[PDB]
Amino acid sequence: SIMSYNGGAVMAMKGKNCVAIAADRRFGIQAQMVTTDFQKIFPMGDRLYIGLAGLATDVQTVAQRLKFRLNLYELKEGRQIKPYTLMSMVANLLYEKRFGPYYTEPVIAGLDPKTFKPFICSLDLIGCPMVTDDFVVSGTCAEQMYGMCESLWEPNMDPDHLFETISQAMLNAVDRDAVSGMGVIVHIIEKDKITTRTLKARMD
Amino acid sequence: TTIAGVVYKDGIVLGADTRATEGMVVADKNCSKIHFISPNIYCCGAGTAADTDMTTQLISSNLELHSLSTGRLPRVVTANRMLKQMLFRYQGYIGAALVLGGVDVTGPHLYSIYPHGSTDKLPYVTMGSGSLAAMAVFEDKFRPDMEEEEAKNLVSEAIAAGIFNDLGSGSNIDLCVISKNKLDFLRPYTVPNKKGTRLGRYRCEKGTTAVLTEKITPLE
Amino acid sequence: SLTTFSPSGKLVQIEYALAAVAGGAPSVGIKAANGVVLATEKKQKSILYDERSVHKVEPITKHIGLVYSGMGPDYRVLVHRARKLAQQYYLVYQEPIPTAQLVQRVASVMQEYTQSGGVRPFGVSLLICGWNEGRPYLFQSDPSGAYFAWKATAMGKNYVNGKTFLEKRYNEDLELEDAIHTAILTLKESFEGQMTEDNIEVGICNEAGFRRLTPTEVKDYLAAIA
Amino acid sequence: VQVKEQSILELGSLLAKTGQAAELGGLLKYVRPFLNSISKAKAARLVRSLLDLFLDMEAATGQEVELCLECIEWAKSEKRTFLRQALEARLVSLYFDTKRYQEALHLGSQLLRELKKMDDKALLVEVQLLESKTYHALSNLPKARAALTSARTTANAIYCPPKLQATLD
Amino acid sequence: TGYDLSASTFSPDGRVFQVEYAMKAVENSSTAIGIRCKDGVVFGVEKLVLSKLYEEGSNKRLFNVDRHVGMAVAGLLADARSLADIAREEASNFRSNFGYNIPLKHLADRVAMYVHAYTLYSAVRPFGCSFMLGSYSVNDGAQLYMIDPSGVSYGYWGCAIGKARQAAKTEIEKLQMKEMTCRDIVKEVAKIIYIVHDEVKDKAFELELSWVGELTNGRHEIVPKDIREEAEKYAKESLKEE
Amino acid sequence: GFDRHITIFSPEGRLYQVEYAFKAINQGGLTSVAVRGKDCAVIVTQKKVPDKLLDSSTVTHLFKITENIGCVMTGMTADSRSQVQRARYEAANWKYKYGYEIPVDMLCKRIADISQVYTQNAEMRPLGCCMILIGIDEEQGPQVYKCDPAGYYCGFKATAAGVKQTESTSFLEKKVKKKFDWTFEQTVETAITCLSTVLSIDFKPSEIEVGVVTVENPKFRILTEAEIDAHLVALAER
Amino acid sequence: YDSRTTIFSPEGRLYQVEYAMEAIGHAGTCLGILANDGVLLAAERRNIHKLLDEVFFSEKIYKLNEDMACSVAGITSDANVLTNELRLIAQRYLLQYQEPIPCEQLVTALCDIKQAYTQFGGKRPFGVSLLYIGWDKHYGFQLYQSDPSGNYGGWKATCIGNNSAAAVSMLKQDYKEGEMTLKSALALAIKVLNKTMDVSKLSAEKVEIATLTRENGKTVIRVLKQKEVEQLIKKHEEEEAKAEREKKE
């Protein structure tokens, strides 16, 4: 598939007062390997991150375009975006090309800029929103981390327990996919800080 | 996917399942498919979920701008009319299968709408992957001038039959009854299926994963 | 027309616009701690007219409202543009529009409509009210497009004396809906015949949203209160 | 379904027509707890109508002054202002009629500060006139004359001497 | 003055002078009479020949905008040709879209809309031609209409336009055309034309007569030559005996 | 360059051309009056024929704009017919794209916006006719509306339009002061007497046009000569 | 039907651009000073009235991006349209190039588009003048002044106020070259607004001050709070107490 041309794996998990968002760092062309230092999670808020898996050029293009529209929005309003509003913006941007769609799965994870309510949602190749309270997914190794979700999730995580759970989830998901892995970046977003950890993974 | 609608003596009863699927896996276990159209008209969507969402949203939108331009309550067949023009202009490339139900000054109205633009008026309609089981339930049990609670039970058991007989339908049932004097949206009418309990403990304890590089950014 | 700069650096066209607005219908707005009241006076020319047929306030949405002073058909077409613009904001955004945003949208619309040639610029002034994020909002827009923030103001006929009166009144701490009685007083200072059941229109925007007042409670507030 | 809201017609009218004071107060407490069920405009108009029904009827002041006080406290529960100023206008009229001397002057400190916040005349004029009349009732020319002149500052605007400028004269 | 040079500006009294100048330009031209008989419509126009060098029959103001509809012209002839072309193509579009002969009132409405649309703006001047439309069918009888450049389309039993329009409609009114057949209508129209020719005020003239009706089987056409060349003949017996 | 010729604001913003258009409407020496009854609405318009040569059936100022709504014009005839056709177009467009009989207010609003965009720009005549609609709306009864070339409108219990405007309004107001449930034949009798006392002509039955739309007959209809003279001889003694 | 408004003067100039100049001449007042450590811009907001809500957070200041900021004078509507165009073109540059525009490229884009507006079309020019304050890696802190005529330049400290040339004259007489000294620059702005504005006593509820400074690779842009503004003001008028001490000597 054109989805499985580059691979890519994005996960986001919900905690009690925090969120987690992890992604594989592998970039390559099919079985050929290009670089193990590719960026899929992008910070567009003080507490609000977007994970993007899919076509790497489509990831970069939609990231630049949403940053474009986002800072235009924030300069126009004079206020920070809400995660629900960002979900609406992602849906509108992705649906603007229904006959010409970008080949990617966006994932939105963050806290409320005023109330610090956790928020996680995922959108398809045409911008249908799935706002969840437990987990959202993106990638070629989707069913692996689906199993990780349904066998590792419990409500009201501690941020460290959140980090460990999503770390083991992403590691065991990418260990069975030949087109995902090469190091995992994990962000834990809470009210007063954000901690990003690069995990030790399999390099084969 | 299983959506349905029934005309009863005082209005419309709409029902739907809450299972949203991608490929073979189910994506959303509590998806909402009954969509807000106007304070007297609602629609249930099926097929491509984003397509149904945008279609119901923009049609509904033109519904309240019409109401504000007219200063009066909107009607159902006007909504159906611009649904069918919006679908027919696009030659069915947008796969939105719709059930429109409402009550206006002319009375209750119910319609089934195809993605290619064909529209039908019936006292009872079914749509979705599990349309046939609910249609069989209705053909077995519907009679004209149905009471409200019995119609609620009929729609609920038809959606349950579509859930338990069609693979693309499952999880919960949501209802919406529209009357002249009231309107109630019973999102989780019944919960027929629950998640099984967990036996083993798979708690990823703290310190299980090693870290190469770290950063911490304090927030204002 | 292609109006340009005078040797004095003044646009005589927008001066004529505001002069025509100043001869328009008197109206008043006040922002209290629980919402915004807008109020206006409609003097029907004869008993032949129907007061309920045409209104002076129009709901853009559940929580946004705008009264006016000046031209009539200009006001109704601007109501159409404002409603439609707020609606595509809701289309792209799927959340109700805040007040100040549609304020600069309509101010921009005024800027091109006084900028583009061929078209005569508009001869209306608009007053906007809404309830966004708990804090109420009331603004004024001129034909030239310069939008101002006012917690209490008067626009239309004899607006300067009303402004001075609300300077004497309106300590801006009325947490209750007593400022509507102050608006009734402000209109009664310029009312021609009497404060009646239909000549005065009053609109409120509270936490529940913007709601046009039924003339029953308009007659109620006309009674006893003043 | 609220049709008893306007149902002060029979008994409320017959209170004034027949003439009785205790039954008026009993009606005032009769709809007093029910008063927090209707619109605020209807509540204000109903309170004003019931109060000025018997505020001119009878001099049996064993109930009426605390009825006015409890209506002030009800107004503070509603937090309505012009309602309030009308109430203390009524009580200072009742106090001048009953002539209990002292705290009528304690009206002024509780009035003037409020009436100089806004350019208000009619309430200010009547409270100044009644204060001057009460202070003359204790037979002290200087400060009563000073209050009379202070009322005579507001010798402008208005529309007529309906009750105001004729009482000034 | 500055308030008479545009078709989009208004006089203080509520008048447009461009269309009034158009009316004056129309009435400057010579005369033309349309008449409705019991079965059909007859058109009678006189045209002044300017010199014998013309090969006769030049710029005849009668045109066949439709097979079943004829029309008569006074005013400016180029605008008349443009309107005739518009009428022909609109009848063509009607019978292409609908598949039957267009009613006279409908096409009169369409050309009225067309001539009034050119009065709206200032980029185009009002026209300088007033014309008449006549038709007959068994489905509706005989129909006659008259349209001025301002856009007023009125039906008539008998109508006239031109310099001698006053005496023309005067002598139209003194005849009971509702009872006379087409053969009498021809001689009446010829007599009225000869009366209103006025002789001394103009040069030599020529006559043009056109027919529509059941005698022509509803298809509009010019008069035959044998029906012609008798107009002068019963003129010369009906001339004044001094 | 001054605005006495083209639509621009003035000192005190007086758009001279719109009052000029109002005088252009008053140039045509005709009048119409519309009266709404309890369950009926009537439009009574006078006409004049200069001669018997013209076909009197061709001259008509009342038009069946839809099957349930009637309209009547005053001003120059061609612009009147033009905006009749435009309102016809918009009514048919609404019926096609919505599927129900358009309420009278929506037609009124749309052509009011059309008049507004006429008078908004230059290079466009701001039109010279005034308009009356009569109709029936469900749960509303009869409705009578009026439009100007400036795009203004309102709701009227009864109104009039023509040269002799003001005395018609005064008579109508002093009659509606004692309104008291106007009935159908009484409405047409009052309208006929109003037009008669305004014109002081005591018209014969063949000089008038009457159009009545009723709740009992929601289809808009045109009064024939027989019932016209029947109502005249009904109002002859009174 | 008579509107040319696009042709040169019989002597060579343009009537429209000079009418725009004297239209800016009676507009509001805003001034800016460059420094080595940052840049400040102080304005007086007009129509200071008790009934204003003042909920726009220094409306005379417009943050064009995270780095470079704007101020405008003239017609408010044309100012809004123009500043929206500046946001559009700047963020189009950010889209085409994943780095901020330095300072001057956007200024040149504005000068181009306003020249095209005053070249043809037969429409009125936008009578707005703007001040641009920003930072770049190429030249540090950079300041520009865009007149509506299209001409622009790199003045270190200037204004477009109703007393523009007056404050330019006091700046020229009283500028220290190469000294950042941000507190002294604030004092300079305070005394300039003192001497230039006709009103006295320097009400903090009549003025606004915005500051831009490079910090941790972010170029933080702040608006001075009301308490800070009045504190700086009161420090300014108590500074002039020793000036009136020489008197006889």
What is the CATH architecture of E1-238? 4-Layer Sandwich (3.60)
Within 10 angstroms of residue B188's Cβ, the number of other Cβ atoms is 12
What is the phi/psi pair of residue C31, to 5°? -115, 110
Q: Could you please report the per-residue DSSP string of C52-96?
A: TTS-S--BSSSSEEEEEEE-HHHHHHHHHHHHHHHHHHHHHHSSP
For residue G80 the two structure tokens come to 């809004």
Element (H, E) at F130: strand F129-137
Strand order in the sheet with F129-137: C49-50, F153-156, F141-147, F129-137, F70-75, F62-63
For residue E181 the two structure tokens come to 């057949």
For residue C101 the two structure tokens come to 């945003």
8 A C-beta contact, residue G189 and residue G42: yes
Q: B58 to chain C, minimum CA–CA distance in Å?
A: 7
8 A C-beta contact, residue A2 and residue A104: no
Q: Find chain A residues with C-beta within 8 A of B217's C-beta.
A: 193-194
Residue D145's contacts (CB-CB under 8 Å, 6 or more residues apart) are none
Go through the domains of chain F in sequence order and give each one's CATH number.
Answer: 1-238 (3.60.20.10)
| DSSP 8-state class, residue D19 | I
Rounded CA gap, B44 and B37, in Å? 10
- Cα angle, residue F196 at apex, residues F191 and F198 outer, rounded to 5°: 95
Element (H, E) at B22: strand B20-22
Rounded CA gap, E35 and E47, in Å? 18
Rounded CA gap, C54 and C201, in Å? 11
Q: Find chain G residues with C-beta within 8 A of A73's C-beta.
A: none
Beta strands in chain G (DSSP E): 29-34, 39-44, 61-63, 69-74, 128-136, 140-146, 152-153, 157-159, 207-213, 220-223
Q: Specify the CATH number for the domain of residue C199.
A: 3.60.20.10
Q: B82 to chain F, minimum CA–CA distance in Å?
A: 7
Q: Could you tell me where the DSSP H helices lie in F57-101? A: 77-98
Q: Do residue F23 and residue E14 have CB atoms under 8 angstroms apart?
A: yes
Report in angstroms the alpha-carbon separations of B41 from B37, B77, B177.
6, 10, 10
SS3 F97: helix
Q: Does E6 touch chain F (CB under 8 A)?
A: yes
Dihedral Cα D13, D18, D22, D25, nearest 10 deg: 10
Could you say which residues from 21 to 80 on chain B have a Cβ atom under 8 Å away from some Cβ of chain A? Answer: 22, 25, 27-28, 31, 48-51, 53-54
Closest CA to E162 of E119, E103, E222, E205: E205
* Radius of gyration, alpha carbons of chain E: 18
Subunits touching D (CB < 8 Å, at least 3 pairs)? C
SS3 B41: strand
Residue G34's contacts (CB-CB under 8 Å, 6 or more residues apart) are G133, G141, G143, G156, G157
- Do B and G share at least 3 CB pairs under 8 Å? no
Chain breaks in chain C (C to N over 2.5 A) after: none
Resolution, expressed in angstroms to one decimal: 4.3
Q: Do residue B81 and residue F97 have CB atoms under 8 angstroms apart?
A: yes
Within 10 angstroms of residue A43's Cβ, the number of other Cβ atoms is 15
Q: Where in chain E are the domains?
A: 1-238
Q: Is C175 exposed, middle or buried (0-12, 13-18, 19+ CB in 10 A)?
A: exposed
Report chain C residues touching chain F, CB-CB < 8 A.
Answer: 1, 13, 16-17, 19-20, 23, 46-50, 52-54, 72-74, 76-77, 80, 118-121, 123
G196 HSE (CA, 13 A, CB side) = 27
Q: Does F161 touch chain E (CB under 8 A)?
A: no
> How many beta-carbon pairs under 8 angstroms link C with G?
90
> Is CATH 3.40.50.12160 the right assignment for the domain spanning B2-190?
no
Residue C172's contacts (CB-CB under 8 Å, 6 or more residues apart) are C31, C32, C151, C152
8 A C-beta contact, residue F196 and residue F203: yes
Within 10 angstroms of residue B162's Cβ, the number of other Cβ atoms is 32
SS3 D74: helix
Fold designation for A1-204: Glutamine Phosphoribosylpyrophosphate, subunit 1, domain 1 (3.60.20)
Residues forming a β-bridge with E128 = none
Element (H, E) at A105: strand A104-111
| DSSP 8-state class, residue G45 | P
8 A C-beta contact, residue B40 and residue B102: yes
Domain span at C39: 1-225
Q: Does G91 touch chain A (CB under 8 A)?
A: yes
Which residue type is seen at B53? D
Closest CA to C41 of C51, C52, C27, C54: C27
Q: B205 to chain A, minimum CA–CA distance in Å?
A: 7
Among C165, C174, C224, whose Cβ lies nearest the Cβ of D48? C224
Q: Where in chain G are the domains?
A: 1-245
Under the phi-then-psi rule, with left for phi > 0, alpha for psi from -120 to 50, and beta for the rest, what region is F219? Answer: beta
Domain G1-245 CATH superfamily:
Aminohydrolase, N-terminal nucleophile (Ntn) domain (3.60.20.10)
SS3 D138: coil
For residue A122 the two structure tokens come to 């995922």
Rounded CA gap, G34 and G178, in Å? 10
Rounded CA gap, G220 and A27, in Å? 35
Chain breaks in chain G (C to N over 2.5 A) after: none
Q: Tell which of B58, B217, B220 to mutate to test the A interface (max A CBs under 10 Å).
A: B217
Handedness of CA E173, E179, E185, E188 (dihedral sign): negative
Q: Does A76 touch chain G (CB under 8 A)?
A: yes
Q: Do residue G91 and residue A68 have CB atoms under 8 angstroms apart?
A: yes
Within 10 angstroms of residue C178's Cβ, the number of other Cβ atoms is 22
Q: Do residue A165 and residue B215 have CB atoms under 8 angstroms apart?
A: no
Residue D70's contacts (CB-CB under 8 Å, 6 or more residues apart) are D32
Name the domain count of chain C. Answer: 1
Within 10 angstroms of residue G4's Cβ, the number of other Cβ atoms is 8
Q: Find chain C residues with C-beta within 8 A of G23's C-beta.
A: 5, 9-10
Q: Do residue C101 and residue A77 have CB atoms under 8 angstroms apart?
A: yes
Rounded CA gap, D114 and D111, in Å? 5
Beta strands in B72-172 (DSSP E): 96-104, 107-113, 119-121, 124-128
SS3 E234: helix
Rounded CA gap, A58 and C165, in Å? 62
Q: Is D155 exposed, middle or buried (0-12, 13-18, 19+ CB in 10 A)?
A: exposed
Q: Find chain F residues with C-beta within 8 A of C74's C-beta.
A: 116, 120
Q: Do residue C72 and residue F158 have CB atoms under 8 angstroms apart?
A: no
Active-site residue set of B: 1
Which residue carries 């970008």 as its tokens? Answer: A102
Which residue carries 């310190």 as its tokens? Answer: B207
8 A C-beta contact, residue C137 and residue C99: yes
Q: Find chain A residues with C-beta within 8 A of B205's C-beta.
A: 161, 164
**Experimental method of this PDB entry:** cryo-EM
What is the phi/psi pair of residue E32, to 5°? -170, 140
Rounded CA gap, F16 and F13, in Å? 9
8 A C-beta contact, residue G196 and residue G161: yes
Among F13, F112, F119, whose Cβ lies nearest the Cβ of C20? F13
